[PDB]
RNA sequence: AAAUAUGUAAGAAGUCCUUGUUACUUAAUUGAACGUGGACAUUUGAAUGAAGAGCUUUUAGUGGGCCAUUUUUGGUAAGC
RNA sequence: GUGAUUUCUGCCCAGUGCUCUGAAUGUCAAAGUGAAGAAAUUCAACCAAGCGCGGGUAAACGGCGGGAGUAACUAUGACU
RNA sequence: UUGACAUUGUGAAGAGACAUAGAGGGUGUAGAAUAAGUGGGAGCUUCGGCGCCAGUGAAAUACCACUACCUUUAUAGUUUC
RNA sequence: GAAGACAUUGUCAGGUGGGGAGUUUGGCUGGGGCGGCACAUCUGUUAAACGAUAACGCAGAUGUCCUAAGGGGGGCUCAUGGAGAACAGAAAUCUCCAGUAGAACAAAAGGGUAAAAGCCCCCUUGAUUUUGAUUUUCAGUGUGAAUACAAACCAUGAAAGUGUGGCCUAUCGAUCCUUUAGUCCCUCGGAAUUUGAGGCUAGAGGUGCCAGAAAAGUUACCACAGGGAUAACUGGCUUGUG
């Protein structure tokens, strides 16, 4: 809900410490397919017929994920530090 | 759910004609190339296949065809390729006229002739034209086919006219329709048959309920109804 | 291709010509690139010059309009029209929203939409060449049209577009290609990760080509 | 602004006196926390009671409860 | 499927089913092809049916609206 | 039901592989004028053509690199549709 | 004679496929059901002047919203009379003056709050890192929330201070899995080298039945084990309603 791209949120790393303006994007996703142990074993059925696994998965959602705020300085040289704002829906800096 | 009728029969089960109660059998004989004689003594009355089958020639040292509406209980059943055309005879449809009409007639050469063997239905040879070696034949059906040059041929309308132009007045006579073939009669107006019974599926206030066309290719059991169709009403 | 050959597009490519000696009149070089290729809306730019340094080169009529007061926001200068009785019929669609937001530069108008911009006015125009950018739209479209006319720097928005410069005729090499880079800032890089985001481009001056990659 | 009920405290290891320790904060003879040497305890409101007292393991059943008097919730009411 | 004869088969193909050469184009699996690494491997493009688009189809499943005004006592509807 | 791969090998018409890119180039309303079009452009070349600082319109171009139509054009062995 | 690599046969892939197989179909409830959520929460009360405390008790709020609606210092002080009125003239809105906290603090209700905790300005990003301890069921269970410290690192003021998110009391989530942020740390077990896999610590991704199964009906053809724990009928209170 209007965040402001980069703002001196003290922080560290370290090999730095103190403050440091951090270009702060929010976090995205990441494919896995055919690497995940989750897979390495979850490839089954067992096997002339199957089903899945106890948690798969139709429950009842919440209609509000979370902002994966990903603050990250440039002088501290590292390291893209995650934070957690919770309240949806919203969006970056307006304002 | 049980195994709905249709599914039910087919296999030996308990149904299969009068396979030991009739006369001989179809048979336009075997195959030489230039006419042999045929004195056709007596026309038979069999069962099932109404329309007299009549037993004939026996010449090369001493067969029983289905006989087009033409028996002189001794009739001129001379047949074989080079052979005076006529009601009777049977010449290789590769040497007919153009608008004739053979009854018994063999898909593929030789192999005794069944195409339009039934009561009456004849097979007007309408075509002959486009022919390196074949024939544009009609068919009792209503569709067309190019049979193959020299292939038997009745030569005349199959006997037994309106075997059923009408009118089976009474539930009997079905006294026959059977004592003939299978036990096809009576026939249990399915949609009384209960849920588990056949596929129909009575249900409370009657109802053929949902659908009725029946996709060709369903599970021999999902089957039945109106096969798989291209239409409906009158 | 961000390699040694940059000064082959610059140093070795600074006196190619196509005839005899090398003429007798002034020069004219630069360093081609773009704006961000994003979509001229969400994210692609901010603030900070390179330079760079330039202006038009040819025409500058861009985009600025909204109400009956947006016309005078394009009178003592020259821009496109959004119309009044058109945002409810035909002020946007494909060749429409284009018209007003489809020039060359980008856009320098203000804001006023309501529940209509997910597939019409504000919408259909973005990556086309405009979708409500930062042109200090409050006093008008001239002072912030220093970011939309001259000086510059090199406001790079809408569809590609930008600028570059360093010297005149011949006196640059490592700082010629490294002057082309210098002729690039919030257009070659920026905040969180931005050292590169494209595939290729072009450049020269007037001679012949630059990088042969 | 009650009554009933409800926290604490009690004679007493307690004060009183002497100084000693450093990470603490005071500018420190500033204190803090801790510890030595020294005076007096059976103690002069609290009462009343002790079949010591403390402590450790373990392992049953139980988890459907129901009455009354007062104080109350619903409900015309109820052996609700 | 419906049930002698007799008469009589209204209108609905959007929905669900069925079904046709049909659609100038979008998905669409396995092998087969290309691209990249050192490969493992991971990106690609095209790709049968099918799908979705087009048509027919109700003696196929089944369907068959609702409110306003609206003179020549009065209520009234062939009216709109 | 459909595809691929095996069962499956004799011959014969036509693509694609080895082992290729170049020219006219833009039929809304307006600017004397070539609009799916971009911009680097103040210059290209001993001329000044067009520019351009002016520029309207739905979008401005000669120095032209290009994200994209039409017309226009070479095979000798295996290979494979 | 017909058929002529075709088809067929076989192996995988995809369509299709209630014909067939298996499998499931929350709970609290004046009896089951349709309904409502006292299934997770918060304020007020009910609740008997510490705490605790019941209903399908009464009156209400909760699955968000805030980059500032956070953080510090300045200033200032919030819904009447009597004055000046031109589109204003009941006033919508403008400027003067002289006194009950009646206003305002996002959102329910209650607490609280006046050189403020409200309003106008000024400057920032503490809504920060590491832990741990605490408090919240009369609390021994993890959770969310909140309190005081330590160590860092900042803000802000001249300072002393204050600030570890929205004045306080509501506004959220285990277990495998997956993704990411972390040293560039640990191992692939005959040695290496990279590629990959695996680990450690800090997060996001869902569980609302919110201590966290992944789940359609119908039976009047039906069936079983138990329920006066549980409804039709008698009786029973009670008698509103007659």
Swiss-Prot record, chain A:
Its post-translational modification remark reads: In wild-type cells, 78% of L42 is monomethylated at both Lys-39 and Lys-54, and 22% are a mixture of species with either residue monomethylated.
Residues with the modification N6-methyllysine, per the entry, are: 39, 54
Q: Which Pfam families match?
A: Ribosomal_L44
Record's GO cellular component, any one? cytosol
What GO annotations for molecular function exist for this entry?
Answer: structural constituent of ribosome
Origin: domain of life: Eukaryota
Keyword Cytoplasm on entry? yes
Q: Which GO terms describe its biological process?
A: cytoplasmic translation; response to antibiotic; response to cycloheximide
Subcellular localization is given as: Cytoplasm
* Chief location category: cytoplasm
The record's keywords, sorted A to Z, are: Antibiotic resistance, Cycloheximide resistance, Cytoplasm, Methylation, Ribonucleoprotein, Ribosomal protein
What is the additional note? Present with 13600 molecules/cell in log phase SD medium. There are 2 genes for eL42 in yeast.
Q: What does this protein do?
A: Component of the ribosome, a large ribonucleoprotein complex responsible for the synthesis of proteins in the cell. The small ribosomal subunit (SSU) binds messenger RNAs (mRNAs) and translates the encoded message by selecting cognate aminoacyl-transfer RNA (tRNA) molecules. The large subunit (LSU) contains the ribosomal catalytic site termed the peptidyl transferase center (PTC), which catalyzes the formation of peptide bonds, thereby polymerizing the amino acids delivered by tRNAs into a polypeptide chain.
Q: Whom does it interact with, and what assembly results?
A: Component of the large ribosomal subunit (LSU). Mature yeast ribosomes consist of a small (40S) and a large (60S) subunit. The 40S small subunit contains 1 molecule of ribosomal RNA (18S rRNA) and 33 different proteins (encoded by 57 genes). The large 60S subunit contains 3 rRNA molecules (25S, 5.8S and 5S rRNA) and 46 different proteins (encoded by 81 genes).
Write out the similarity annotation: Belongs to the eukaryotic ribosomal protein eL42 family.
- Name of the protein in its database record: Large ribosomal subunit protein eL42A
> What is the organism field in this record?
Saccharomyces cerevisiae (strain ATCC 204508 / S288c)
UniProtKB/Swiss-Prot annotation, chain B:
- What's the stated role of this polypeptide? Component of the ribosome, a large ribonucleoprotein complex responsible for the synthesis of proteins in the cell. The small ribosomal subunit (SSU) binds messenger RNAs (mRNAs) and translates the encoded message by selecting cognate aminoacyl-transfer RNA (tRNA) molecules. The large subunit (LSU) contains the ribosomal catalytic site termed the peptidyl transferase center (PTC), which catalyzes the formation of peptide bonds, thereby polymerizing the amino acids delivered by tRNAs into a polypeptide chain.
Q: Which positions hold the covalent cross-link Glycyl lysine isopeptide (Lys-Gly) (interchain with G-Cter in ubiquitin)?
A: 42, 83, 109, 135
Segments passing through the bilayer: none
- Residues where Phosphoserine is found: 48, 85, 149-150
- The source organism is Saccharomyces cerevisiae (strain ATCC 204508 / S288c) (Baker's yeast)
A biological-process GO annotation: cytoplasmic translation
The entry's family comment says:
Belongs to the universal ribosomal protein uL2 family.
> Does the keyword field hold Ribonucleoprotein?
yes
> SMART domains this protein is in?
Ribosomal_L2, Ribosomal_L2_C
Tell me the name of the encoding gene: RPL2B
Name of the molecule in the record: Large ribosomal subunit protein uL2B
* SUPFAM superfamilies, per database record: Nucleic acid-binding proteins, Translation proteins SH3-like domain
What binding partners and quaternary form does the record give? Component of the large ribosomal subunit (LSU). Mature yeast ribosomes consist of a small (40S) and a large (60S) subunit. The 40S small subunit contains 1 molecule of ribosomal RNA (18S rRNA) and 33 different proteins (encoded by 57 genes). The large 60S subunit contains 3 rRNA molecules (25S, 5.8S and 5S rRNA) and 46 different proteins (encoded by 81 genes).
Q: Give any GO molecular function from the UniProt entry.
A: structural constituent of ribosome
Ordered alphabetically, the record's keywords are:
Cytoplasm, Isopeptide bond, Phosphoprotein, Ribonucleoprotein, Ribosomal protein, RNA-binding, rRNA-binding, Ubl conjugation
Curated annotation (Swiss-Prot), chain C:
Which named protein is this? Large ribosomal subunit protein uL1A
Name where it's found: Cytoplasm
For this protein, what is any one GO molecular function term? RNA binding
Gene that this polypeptide is encoded by: RPL1A
Q: Which SUPFAM superfamilies match?
A: Ribosomal protein L1
Q: What keywords are annotated for this sequence in UniProt? A: Acetylation, Cytoplasm, Methylation, Phosphoprotein, Ribonucleoprotein, Ribosomal protein
Per the entry, what this protein does is: Component of the ribosome, a large ribonucleoprotein complex responsible for the synthesis of proteins in the cell. The small ribosomal subunit (SSU) binds messenger RNAs (mRNAs) and translates the encoded message by selecting cognate aminoacyl-transfer RNA (tRNA) molecules. The large subunit (LSU) contains the ribosomal catalytic site termed the peptidyl transferase center (PTC), which catalyzes the formation of peptide bonds, thereby polymerizing the amino acids delivered by tRNAs into a polypeptide chain.
Q: Which GO terms describe its biological process?
A: cytoplasmic translation; ribosomal large subunit export from nucleus
The record's section on Gene3D superfamilies has:
3.30.190.20, 3.40.50.790
Q: Fill in the misc note.
A: Present with 116000 molecules/cell in log phase SD medium. There are 2 genes for uL1 in yeast.
Q: Name one GO cellular component term.
A: cytosolic large ribosomal subunit
Q: How does it assemble?
A: Component of the large ribosomal subunit (LSU). Mature yeast ribosomes consist of a small (40S) and a large (60S) subunit. The 40S small subunit contains 1 molecule of ribosomal RNA (18S rRNA) and 33 different proteins (encoded by 57 genes). The large 60S subunit contains 3 rRNA molecules (25S, 5.8S and 5S rRNA) and 46 different proteins (encoded by 81 genes). uL1 forms part of the L1 stalk.
Q: Which residues carry this modification: Phosphoserine?
A: 76, 83
Q: Which InterPro entries match?
A: eL8/uL1-like, Ribosomal_uL1, Ribosomal_uL1-like, Ribosomal_uL1/biogenesis, Ribosomal_uL1_3-a/b-sand, Ribosomal_uL1_CS
Entry comment on modification after translation? N-terminally acetylated by acetyltransferase NatA.
